[PDB]
Ligand binder design. Structure first.
Ligand SMILES: NC(=O)c1ccc[n+]([C@@H]2O[C@H](COP(=O)([O-])OP(=O)(O)OC[C@H]3O[C@@H](n4cnc5c(N)ncnc54)[C@H](O)[C@@H]3O)[C@@H](O)[C@H]2O)c1
Ligand SMILES: NC(=O)c1ccc[n+]([C@@H]2O[C@H](COP(=O)([O-])OP(=O)(O)OC[C@H]3O[C@@H](n4cnc5c(N)ncnc54)[C@H](O)[C@@H]3O)[C@@H](O)[C@H]2O)c1
Ligand SMILES: NC(=O)c1ccc[n+]([C@@H]2O[C@H](COP(=O)([O-])OP(=O)(O)OC[C@H]3O[C@@H](n4cnc5c(N)ncnc54)[C@H](O)[C@@H]3O)[C@@H](O)[C@H]2O)c1
Ligand SMILES: NC(=O)c1ccc[n+]([C@@H]2O[C@H](COP(=O)([O-])OP(=O)(O)OC[C@H]3O[C@@H](n4cnc5c(N)ncnc54)[C@H](O)[C@@H]3O)[C@@H](O)[C@H]2O)c1
Lengths: 257, 257, 268, 269
């Protein structure tokens, strides 16, 4: 495949879009370093991933034919995340692609929702970049860093809940991370871009809370996780070698409507 | 390939990026309706394409194994452009993809440069869209319209020459066409996006005038026409089925620098 | 006032927003060079200004106490526009502020609508900038160029009509003009910015016709056409007040900006 | 003046731009609720404001002829900030204008710089909005909320230092706060906008650490890419205060959801 011999580090890889990236990039030949919390955060009113789900991602990727290192780790904890990445490096010996995908959407928790969404969705993305840079720079072969933002990183879409205004703030902060790192790493031939999905059919929105709590331009209800994985697989390939500093909506026209 | 059975209408197909689109989309299985002015505009201080160059594109596409209908046509003349497209529809029977690529960069012609760049780069893009819509809508199978803008469509980069100011104004106007047509056509599952290259190695910039007249974030001097064609080939594929309303820089970080 | 001793050149000054700029900047002490077509363009489905309306602007500004030179001129015709500007310069002796406000919204005219809206709303703005630059540069005291775009200069809001997609294209092109001229002219301390109103109560939209089309746009969309704040329409004075700030010393270092004056429409 | 009978809550009011906002809005007739940390933060290598400076802002505003309630408060501590605002509400009886101006620029502190800059410049701005909303909504007379971002809120103007990356991320996050609150509050006629200065002449820009940062950033680029477009070395605090005074006035009654550069053309360059 176009990614044979490369290694992709993916946060939130136990299910949802993170699993879709693991499967898609492995299908294209990449080996995978997969991390997920595999535990609950109290301000999040829907279940986060289980250890069983991370093991399921591992089986899918192994069946495709790639090597995979999978660790439980929390993106909020730099030492934890660094240790997990280093386990992947010890086994696979290189790093080419980073997909900073782990995220949460807390609600109905008061300001705990603000703090937790900033911590996972902004600080955790910072940590994901920071733990990867020294390897990418030392290797001297360029690479790709893909940050997962949202429509809410470019538009004021949300409710008054602290976790929702925090989600908007965090996802906007992720665009800032993208833009500064695209500038800092361009000289190293490391591309940095952000992806902005509107709604995607995953357990972040397919849950009891969201149904009880509860439009794109194209007549598309919700995107598939594969739509997001397909965009990312293009971006990290040689077909997109000179694409950097871009905010890419994958959204059936939502941001332009 | 992924585009077998589809037809792509490409303006400015005689050379440069237009040729690169014709070759890349044909390699993916598409048949081609190729048009070019194949004549000079007096305000443009470098040579435009010749009839022989359009014939050379035809040979390349036929050698790849796709069908191609090529006509001389001026994007400024709606009737000319419509007749040319119709020659292609009469032989190939359908239309799926439109690449509004023809463009000029006049200089040193005073206000004739202003007029000519608006007429080719803005009015000509409107005509390219307008003549394609009836077929796409009557078919009812969706499609893709790709408008070629520039860094100068999103940033104030230019000199005081009326042809240069006009290039900025026209390429900005192309973004506006993209945004309104993406909204107008979303219901028909017709995606509309714009591409924003910075510099590309073609005879628009590789000529005697430009040498006499006298950077990106990544250490890349100029992009290849293939870089722009690679982006477009992805956009018009099912891998980008829900991408619409986007301004996509293909620019080694120029717009983010 | 804060603009005493300065001169403002305003296109489309016979009525509407252009008249509002003339009276607002005159109230702050500016003298005025006012131009308008004062004639109809066949693709435009509502009446353009009359000669009597331009004369009425002149009286309003004289009653305020400023000097004003007014001429019938077409922004599409650089020579017409330059002659009119020069009549104003001969009388007032300087130029400080340019407001490129003339514009049209053709509809239901076929491709004549495309060509006319590009010609007035984009080429006419270019002409307005180009006739003014030499004076501003020769004086060496800086100045302000204010281009009137629209929400449709930053968003794809329009209908399936050559005049409407042309309005979007033109108003987006006006942002381009702003951005490149802000860079070209910054070294001369000439500020260049664009203003983006949503709907403003003038004869351009205060007609049966526009309300028809708004109703169809509304029905065709899944309050999409409405502002974020509960404000039905902005006053011309809202746009004139923004411009009066921008061209003052209170905004001396504001350049290269797209400024929405829109009750939150673009952010909605 | 145009703001006679109005009350403006300003964070970081002890010196710099915050003092300039207090003086400028007072000159237009407003009464002021002024808060500042009046203390140091270890990751910030230059001095923050002193209690003396806050008392000097009080003197300036009283001399202009307005009433002012000033309190020491940390925007990172929602309860502290709420208590300070309440002290001003208890005395002045209303609120019309919020200027979320307090901010820091940590550097050479490792990841403590990341955490502190997010905490002050993003979380602190959230707290400033949150403590003001109930009063604004209960009054039912509209109002203005102005968030102070930066060029670095719209462009990736930063170095690799965690405090700098964090400054870019936080200032971008402020735009997000603006956009969502403009939508949430529009129905109440409460305008929300953000201001994006480039460089402004205050201790944040002229200390030796920032100076060395600016020199390093200039040397890293091949393009005077760190300068403004107009030949203006640095903006005055009054340039930012003048823009805010306009925005909160009836001359800008329908301006909301806008990112406003005040930057001598920097972002467009
Ligand atoms: N689902 C949507 O509609 C949608 C829309 C736009 C953007 N996004 C974003 O896409 C990303 C992927 O989310 P998803 O839709 O696949 O939802 P998801 O909840 O199915 O997946 C998120 C994953 O991240 C993990 N995770 C959460 N906190 C973590 C932490 N502290 N450390 C390590 N792992 C952590 C979860 O356990 C989970 O497996 C997120 O950044 C999210 O904000 C989602
Ligand atoms: N080359 C660059 O650096 C660069 C950078 C950004 C964007 N662009 C854009 O890329 C597009 C392709 O240009 P290119 O780089 O391949 O340059 P090019 O000059 O090699 O190709 C442009 C082609 O369009 C044709 N054309 C010009 N006017 C025409 C008309 N009135 N009707 C029909 N055909 C006409 C030419 O004859 C030519 O074959 C243009 O829209 C251009 O503005 C180029
Ligand atoms: N009214 C709105 O809702 C709205 C919203 C956003 C932007 N705009 C823009 O505001 C500007 C002012 O328009 P308005 O609302 O006051 O409408 P208006 O029709 O009342 O005023 C426009 C004026 O320009 C004149 N004019 C038109 N073409 C001309 C030409 N070729 N040369 C010289 N003068 C010409 C008219 O005769 C008229 O007096 C325009 O650029 C318009 O596109 C209007
Ligand atoms: N100076 C520039 O060039 C520049 C450029 C763009 C944006 N900004 C921003 O302008 C705003 C004002 O900064 P300034 O230039 O006046 O600098 P400054 O350092 O002179 O003023 C900042 C003030 O905020 C206070 N403050 C800091 N942390 C606090 C906290 N936790 N709680 C309460 N008060 C706190 C300080 O003590 C001080 O009085 C900041 O948001 C800053 O990021 C500054």
């Amino acid at each position: 495949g176009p990614l044979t011999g490369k290694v992709a580090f993916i946060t939130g890889a136990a299910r949802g879009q993170g699993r879709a990236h693991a499967v898609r990039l492995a299908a294209d030949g990449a080996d995978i370093i997969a991390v997920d919390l595999c535990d609950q955060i109290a301000s999040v009113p829907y279940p986060l991933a289980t250890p069983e789900e991370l093991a399921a991602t591992v089986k899918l990727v192994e069946d495709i034919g790639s090597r995979i290192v999978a660790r439980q780790a929390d993106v909020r904890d730099r030492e934890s995340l660094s240790a997990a990445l280093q386990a992947g490096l010890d086994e696979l010996g290189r790093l080419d692609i980073v997909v900073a995908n782990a995220g949460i959407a807390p609600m109905s928790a008061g300001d705990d929702g603000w703090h937790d969404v900033i911590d996972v969705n902004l600080t955790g993305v910072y940590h994901t970049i920071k733990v990867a840079i020294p390897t990418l720079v030392k290797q001297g072969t360029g690479g790709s860093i893909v940050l997962i933002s949202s429509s809410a990183g470019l538009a004021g879409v949300g409710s008054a809940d602290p976790g929702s205004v925090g989600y908007v703030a965090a996802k906007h902060g992720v665009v800032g991370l993208m833009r500064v790192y695209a500038n800092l790493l361009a000289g190293q031939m490391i591309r940095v871009n952000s992806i902005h999905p509107s709604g995607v059919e995953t357990p972040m929105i397919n849950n009891e809370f969201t149904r009880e709590w509860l439009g794109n331009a194209m007549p598309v209800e919700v995107l598939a996780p594969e739509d997001v994985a397909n965009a990312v697989a293009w971006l990290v390939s040689d077909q997109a070698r000179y694409i950097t500093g871009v905010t890419l909506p994958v959204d059936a026209g939502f941001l332009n409507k």
